[PDB]
């Protein structure tokens with residue numbers, strides 16, 4: 001019998017006409033203003049029109065399914081994609097499993113770190129849909145940044161970039177490790193998210209030749225409350241002011257694909273800052289559907305399945 005593999009991600013507009021309803025969904029059903037829509041649409045336009053996140057997420061979910069099924073024959077996995085803010089929604093994926101007769105599923109979020117605003121909400125929605133339908137039972141993975149192959153993947157990508165920096169400028173190079181920002185109040189309740197990112201930065205740093213590093217956040221939202229900082233743009237300016245770094249290497253390790261928050265918030269907004277101070281910009285390829293990353297996810301899911309049984 002088959003075990004459902006519920007692969008969850010944020011979602012992205014398929015078409016330009018979808019941007020309004022996607023943004024409305026992000027804002028809990030409250031339609032943004034015309035100025036807010038125009039600004040978002042202009043960011044998608046700046047990165048080429050739309051984001052490739054849709055096809056990357058699919059390649060990741062079906063590449064993971066194939067890696068799992070080609071590596072063993074104790075069980076057959078069947079992947080279902082459930083998205084947070086556009087169809088197929090999380091609830092649609094759970095419905096489809098139930099209608100297919102899946103009785104047992106493992107879920108994974110395509111974000112390696114846990115927080116109350118991200119993975120918690122994914123898991124709450126998946127379990128609430130399964131409770132109503134009467135199945136499947138969902139066994140959730142909460143985080144997986146500690147996976148050794150995950151850390152080694154990012155260190156290899158950073159070391160390949162650093163090898164193309166001149167040896168006499170490596171001492172003036174800094175590795176900026178980042179994730180999506182969240183409201184700062186999550187620290188008041190000891191949410192694990194900021195600690196998990198610091199841990200990820202520490203594990204990577206001990207495996208790369210780059211001698212300096214700093215932790216930052218990015219892509220904070222339009223609210224009137226404080227968000228986790230420093231922002232990667234502001235941190236770049238500060239570090240140039242104190243240390244005069246010549247090379248900035250940005251690894252937004254909270255993300256797993258090349259989407260709007262990397263293509264715009266790093267490759268446009270951070271490059272604007274490195275240009276202003278006169279430093280070089282580097283941003284290694286994201287994991288996307290590269291086989292080494294599919295192997296990270298296969299290890300994570302197969303270890304989860306091994307520990308249930």
Ligand code: FEC
Pocket residue numbers: 009010011012013023026027040051052053084110111115117118180181182183220221222254255259260261
């Ligand atoms: C955490 C976290 C992740 C990583 C975990 C996971 O991937 O789900 C995360 C991942 C992503 C990814 C990719 C994308 C890119 C989608 C694509 O079109 O390329 C992506 C894109 C957007 N996020 Fe995002 N996120 N995000 C928040 C937290 C997280 N976010 C919070 C909080 C709010 C604030 C909600 C509100 O305003 O009340 C919020 C709002 C937006 C908007 C709305 C427009 C704007 O104002 O910027 C867009 C577009």
Ligand SMILES: [Ca+2]
Pocket residue numbers: 218219220265
């Ligand atoms: Ca921003």
